[PDB]
Each structure stands twice: as C-alpha cells, then as structure tokens.
DNA sequence: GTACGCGCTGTCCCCCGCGTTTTAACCGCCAAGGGGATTACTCCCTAGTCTCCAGGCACGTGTCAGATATATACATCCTGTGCATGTA
C-alpha cells in the first residue's frame, strides 16, 4: 500500500487493466484489499467489516 | 648605461575526451520506539530608583634632566729681534 510504485502507476491513462500473478497470499487481507483498490478506485478502505 | 621586458623559437608533456569498470544511493520490509524544543504555569529575588556622605583623578605647581651659550687656559703660526763668523 505504502510503496511509491503503488501510487506511481495509479494515475496512468488506461481504460482496461489485466493482472498476471501466480498466487496471492491467502491470509493478511491487507494486500488483497490493496490489490482490489488498485484494480478500481471504488471500494472502501474498511475490509475488516 | 644597460639589462630586463618582450617577441620568437623549439621541446615535450600533462590534462581532455571518449570509453570502460566500479560503486553510492534510493526503493521495500516491518512498523517499532525515542527525545528535545515548545507552551503553559508557578513562584521569587535582584536591579531600578531614590538617597546623602565620602572622595579622587583632572588640574596646577616644583624640581631634576637634557641640551646650549660662555669665559678660559693653553695651542699653533706669526712677528719682531738679537747673535756669530766670513767676505773684498
């Protein structure tokens, strides 16, 4: 979440994005929530609800 | 008068540039603690101010020091002044 590259690529002008990854981490919901927010900026920060 | 500033010369030589090697620094982790100037508050105590009585460095006066003009007892030529022996 706090990485500079995370905010670096958010402003890029694209209308469709695709993610390629083998396996994300199961627990530690923070990284999954961060990936979800990066995919589209609509979800709320509160993932503990 | 003269010799050093100036102009010219060759001699070579050390940094420039372009390339190649090596490395300092920021990003991620993983969020953790850690301390020092700041703001507010609470006492607290020593200089400002007044105060008069003592007194002391700027000031004027005396006297030795340093330097200078003045007779003074010789000092060095200068002026008369006298003597002895050979000459026509």
- Mind giving me the DSSP string for A15-45? S------S---SS-HHHHHHHHHHH-TTS-S
User: Given in angstroms, what resolution was this structure solved at?
Assistant: 3.8
Q: Quote the CA–CA distance of A6 and A23 in Å, as a whole number.
A: 19
As a rounded value in angstroms, the CA-to-C1' distance for A14 and B79 is 145
Q: Which nucleotides of B are covered by protein (CB under 7 A)?
A: 27-29, 31
As a rounded value in angstroms, the CA-to-C1' distance for A26 and B63 is 116
Which residues of the protein have their beta carbon within 7 Å of strand B? A 2-6, 8, 30
Q: Quote the CA–CA distance of A9 and A41 in Å, as a whole number.
A: 13
A7 closest-nt by C1' vs CA:
B27
List the determination method.
cryo-EM
């Amino acid at each position: 979440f706090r990485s500079t590259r995370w905010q670096a690529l958010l402003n890029f002008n694209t209308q469709r994005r695709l993610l390629l990854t083998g396996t994300p981490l199961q627990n530690n919901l923070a990284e999954l929530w961060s990936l979800l927010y990066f995919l589209m900026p609509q979800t709320v920060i509160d993932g503990k609800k």
